[PDB]
């Protein structure tokens, strides 16, 4: 690509060619056109999956959930025109997004009825049916997660950043565990690095060592960050990464901070959190060898809203690790209350 | 940084904030006039007779600063002169390092007079000062000395011993199916066709420092004998530095001044894969010294398209590509090894 950068101290610009990585997090994904491979092809795939024993879909990210919402109406119509008693119901996402063991098949032949493009305006709405193919929702009772397909799409062409482009997708022929690399951007330049995708923005810096600076996650996905898109992948243990490997955290020395281990029991239930190294408001942390051992993460205020004042850690480093959600500040696993017992506090009940 | 960019293939434009790596393939501030002089003086009385440049950046710095440096040395009455020459590739390492002076020269802020004592910066002077008495990699970019909108780089004499290249001028990035490893002299591109592989490289210098692993993609599970650009020539220790069927090119034409690695045949040539071809060795040029063009080459188990180097003086071939019938004793050979 060709592009220009701006400095606003002295109003001028610097232009050239190269590779540009943009901050695409916290941008609305509702303003694109989605093209799962073909209406008849997708209908045949869903039909064959239902006949095999696969009940529904578990979503890798929120982009896939929005794609299914955009598709479901035409998909149900075209399924109806072929005389199949099956309807697709799309729900909402909650974190963390657990992964499933099944995969969505690639049919030999498409269904021999219906139109040949997405977006055909005007269709007779289909009627409800006894059989439901539930895309992820609050419906883990008619069929559990051990019968749901996961990570069965590949992005072939996209225009993210331009609000009226098409996204082209196809159903893959293989089983996989890594995240889709078409939407990943990693870049370092000098003393700053970024690991990013459509829902992650992870920053690093060069102090005495390379370390994690701050992160911003609007989803908790459980695929694996590809090693082709990671900086400094060797010589690092999986038990030192701040963001767990099972939460699509990069396997990098850039994903580390001195004095902390992996945060398997952080507040991963929240819809959106932001990782900082700074004390929660009205709180102080002291480094003492008499403190307790690390456990589940604790919220700074109690269930009634009272702010705890004193916490301790054994061998951690200032500033302390914290999480920022809608509820408020949480603390890392290594930081425990000083005086008030932990039975009075709200603690995380989710493990990675 | 905040900016805008366009993709001409699709005619789509966008703006925002992020990290941008530009293709670049500069009024330096060598420490201080009164302190670099003291460092050079102490080094000369320490037994160091010269400097071996790490890159062309340092050579241009020395060539710009030499006049004022000589003026400072003469005004302080120190019997020493600084002579800077050109750059010959590859740029080999030196075992010494410049000292950090405790105090600056008392005098300083007209030309100078040539003396009998020479502190020879990189040049064609290996007899007066052999490589085993020359300093190397003795400078570091300051904390904010480099940036997108600087056009003036601040350097200072380093206090430690190191082997890696300066990380302040390195930019590497990957976006989708295109990746780049780059600095002020290298521009190394890779792609994903079936696997990740080297696509093309453009080099305007051959350094011998080490590419740091903090600025490298996919550093694990890679053998040092598979890298197309040798690790000894500041090639990244990455799977992005590999191409199927080829090993490390230790005997390529690294004597050039500006190289360009690409995978396609030299003009008017044809390569076939045969199990009855000669073994690998030094790289051979496509045109003989008399101007005649060889036209039929072989490789044993290489992969099409073939590896080729594009210098201003011809089109060389990878170490695995040998002449089929025409004897290679009359062809041109590379005289350097990484």
């Amino acid at each position, epitope marked *: 690509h060709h592009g220009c950068s701006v400095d606003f101290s002295k109003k001028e610009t610097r232009c050239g060619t190269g590779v540009f990585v943009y901050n695409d997090v916290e941008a609305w994904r509702d303003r694109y056109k989605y093209h799962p491979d073909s209406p008849r092809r997708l209908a045949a795939a869903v039909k064959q999956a239902w006949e095999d024993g696969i009940c529904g879909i578990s979503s890798v990210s929120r982009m896939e959930n929005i794609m299914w919402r955009s598709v479901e109406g035409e998909l149900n119509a075209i399924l109806e025109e072929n005389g199949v008693q099956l309807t697709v119901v799309v729900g909402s996402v909650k974190n963390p997004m657990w992964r499933g063991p099944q995969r969505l098949p690639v049919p030999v032949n498409e269904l021999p009825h219906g139109w040949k493009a997405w977006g055909k305006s005007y269709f007779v709405r289909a009627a409800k049916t006894n059989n439901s193919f539930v895309v992820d929702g609050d419906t883990l009772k008619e069929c559990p997660l051990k019968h749901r397909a996961w990570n069965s799409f590949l992005v072939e062409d996209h225009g993210f950043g331009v609000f009226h482009t098409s996204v082209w997708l196809k159903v893959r022929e293989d089983y996989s565990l890594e995240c889709d690399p078409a939407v990943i951007g990693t870049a370092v330049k000098g003393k700053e690095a970024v690991h990013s995708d459509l829902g992650y923005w992870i920053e690093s810096e060069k102090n005495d*060592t390379w370390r994690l600076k701050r992160a911003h996650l609007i989803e908790m996905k459980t695929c694996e960050w590809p090693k082709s898109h990671t900086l400094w992948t060797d*010589g690092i243990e999986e038990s030192d990464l701040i963001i767990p490997k099972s939460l699509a955290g990069p396997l990098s020395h850039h994903n580390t901070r001195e004095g902390y281990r992996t945060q398997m029991k952080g507040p991963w239930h929240s819809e959106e959190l932001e990782i900082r190294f700074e004390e929660c408001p009205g709180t102080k942390v002291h480094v003492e060898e008499t403190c307790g051992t690390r456990g589940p993460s604790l919220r700074s205020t109690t269930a009634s809203g009272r702010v705890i004042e004193e916490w301790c850690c054994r061998e951690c480093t200032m500033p302390p690790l914290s999480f920022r959600a809608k509820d408020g500040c949480w603390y890392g696993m290594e930081i425990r209350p000083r005086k008030e017992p932990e039975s009075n506090l709200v603690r995380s009940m989710v493990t990675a | 940084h905040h900016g805008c960019s366009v993709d001409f293939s699709k005619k789509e434009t966008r703006c925002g904030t992020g990290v941008f790596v530009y293709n670049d393939v500069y009024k330096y501030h060598p420490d201080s006039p009164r302190r670099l002089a003291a460092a050079v003086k102490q080094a000369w009385e320490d037994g160091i007779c010269g400097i071996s440049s790490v890159s062309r950046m340092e050579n241009i710095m020395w060539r710009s600063v030499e006049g004022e440096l000589n003026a400072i040395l003469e005004e302080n009455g120190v019997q020493l002169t600084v002579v800077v020459g050109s750059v010959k590739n590859p740029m080999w390492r030196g*075992p010494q*390092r410049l000292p950090v002076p405790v105090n600056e020269l008392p005098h300083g802020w007209v030309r100078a007079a040539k003396t009998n004592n020479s502190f020879v910066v990189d040049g064609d002077t290996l007899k007066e000062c052999p490589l085993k008495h020359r300093a190397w990699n003795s400078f570091l970019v300051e904390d904010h000395g480099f940036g997108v909108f600087h056009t003036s780089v601040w350097l200072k004499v380093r206090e*430690d*011993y190191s*082997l890696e290249c300066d990380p302040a001028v390195i930019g590497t990035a990957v976006k989708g199916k295109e990746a780049v490893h780059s600095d002020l002299g290298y521009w190394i591109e890779s792609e994903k066709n079936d696997t990740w592989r080297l696509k093309r490289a453009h080099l305007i210098e051959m350094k011998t420092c080490e590419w740091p692993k903090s600025h490298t993609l996919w550093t694990d599970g890679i053998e040092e004998s598979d890298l197309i650009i040798p690790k000894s020539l500041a090639g990244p220790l990455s799977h992005h530095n590999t191409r199927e069927g080829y090993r490390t090119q230790m005997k390529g034409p690294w004597h050039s001044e500006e190289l360009e690695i690409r995978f396609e045949e030299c003009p008017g040539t044809k390569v076939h894969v045969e199990e009855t071809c000669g073994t690998r060795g030094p790289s051979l040029r496509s045109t003989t010294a008399s101007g005649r063009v060889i036209e039929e080459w072989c490789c044993r188990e290489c992969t099409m398209p073939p590896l080729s180097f594009r210098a201003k003086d011809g089109c060389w071939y990878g170490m695995e590509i040998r002449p089929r019938k025409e004897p290679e004793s009359n062809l041109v050979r590379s005289m350097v090894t990484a």
Partner: antibody
Amino acid sequence: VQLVESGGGLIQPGGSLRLSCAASGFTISSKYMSWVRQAPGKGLEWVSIIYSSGSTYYADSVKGRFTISRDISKNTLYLQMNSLRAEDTAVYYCASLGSGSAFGYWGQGTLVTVSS
Amino acid sequence: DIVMTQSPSSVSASVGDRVTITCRASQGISTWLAWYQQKPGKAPRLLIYAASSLQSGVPSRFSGSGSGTDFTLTISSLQPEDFATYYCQQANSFPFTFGPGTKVEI
């Protein structure tokens, strides 16, 4: 500058051990720190190195078993030794790299015995 | 790997005599060589680096020379404090390898 090596004793084969090196007069994050061992009656052997930037390299004999690391706050160098064998018994030194790519400052040594 | 060989295995000399020890490499490690001194019960000490440069604080009665594959360490006036074991090690590429060793007797 000073280098003092502490945590080496007796261990049974197949066991693990952790060595330490305390530095005085300089910061560990500014030098190339290395481990060298000398078998009783034999010569010297280079084990592993850590760069000032944090890069690590190993000899093929101990490639997957030993691990070198640092602690900036404590200003100490470590070596984690796992799945020890008979040929791992020696005196382990703590050395640093400087001009010529050679070792200038050595420790006082620490002996490790692997026997049942 | 680069294998380094040393000769002689042992040598004996009296006070004030000239001593010569030779190191031999198996590849082109040119001018990237160092020489050490090992006393029994002590850590090694660096004497020469870059095949000719004298480490600071070492007496000048030691001298080095060589390039390429062959190298030589010379003591001019032997002293009673200079009876120890001496090694050469290459500094050209990883892994770094030392020499078998040479003992100076009497």
